[PDB]
């Protein structure tokens, strides 16, 4: 009595932030990489916005991190953070998987990514609380609306997850559109401090639940699951982990290491 994925997979396979163990987070070298060549499942997008209003691939809220630039995304034009170098960070933080091809990768926008990988594949898109970047939920449908992604064959199919922390984020958009897949990202230490009627009350948006993988067990995986979760824990980058969680029963992992989970799959 049990729901599993929408893609047809009874494992699917969320690259994190694309080919992010191999190849700079949020690049097209790093989408490419788990689309094309790993074969993953998903490709898993953060999104920020522009000064301009451009929605982007980000993690964090600031370029500091995986740019030669500082500052908030929003404090750059599309323009100005196009001028930005996205793929140096990585050769310096993890030299033997550098390449001189990932020097001056750009950040993407959202409208890119869905171009260039087409209505075939499939996205884990994040949103987040809804006073950081007012809008962004309506911005977001309209991109994928643009991309022939909210057809429903498309919705039903699992082409579109999208995932938030925030509770009223994911309630809009059940709102604005009831027919796509909401996750709900459960923070560490979180999932324990909630009781039946709040997993009900987030059943009524959310079909996936995204907890950290530290936070579960058998008896609370095989607990979502009967409460008719699609359980997707993150980030899952060791073997031994993947095949323990795998066997709980949950139907995927986000993980840096698409190769890695295809693996444990298999063996
Ligand atoms: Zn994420």
């Given amino acids: 009595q049990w729901h599993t994925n929408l893609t047809n997979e009874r494992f699917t396979t969320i690259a994190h932030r694309g080919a992010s163990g191999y190849a700079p987070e949020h690049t097209f070298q790093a989408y490419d990489k788990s689309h094309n060549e ?9 999104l920020q916005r522009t000064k301009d209003g451009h929605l982007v691939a980000m993690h964090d809220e600031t370029v500091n991190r995986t740019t030669n630039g500082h500052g908030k995304v929003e404090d750059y034009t599309l323009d100005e953070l196009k001028q930005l170098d996205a793929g140096s960070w990585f050769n310096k933080k993890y030299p033997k998987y550098a390449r001189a091809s990932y020097k001056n990768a750009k950040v993407p926008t959202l409208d890119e990514i869905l171009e260039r990988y087409g209505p075939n594949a499939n996205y884990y898109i994040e949103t987040k609380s809804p006073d950081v970047y007012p809008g962004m939920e309506e911005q977001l ?13 498309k919705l039903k199919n699992g082409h579109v997850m999208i995932q938030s922390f925030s509770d009223e984020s994911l309630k809009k958009i059940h709102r604005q559109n009831k027919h796509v897949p909401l996750v709900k990202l459960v923070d560490k230490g979180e999932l324990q401090q909630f009781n039946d009627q709040r997993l009900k009350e987030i059943r009524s948006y959310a079909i996936g639940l995204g907890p950290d993988y530290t936070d579960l067990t058998e008896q609370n995986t095989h607990h979502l699951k009967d409460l008719g979760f699609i359980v997707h824990p993150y980030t899952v980058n060791e073997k031994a982990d993947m095949l323990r969680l795998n066997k709980y029963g949950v139907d995927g992992v986000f993980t840096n290491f698409a190769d890695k989970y295809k693996e444990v799959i298999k063996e």
């Fill in 38 to 46: 790993l074969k993953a499942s998903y490709i898993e997008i953060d």
């Fill in 141 to 153: 449908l309209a991109s994928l609306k643009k991309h022939h992604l909210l057809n429903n064959n």
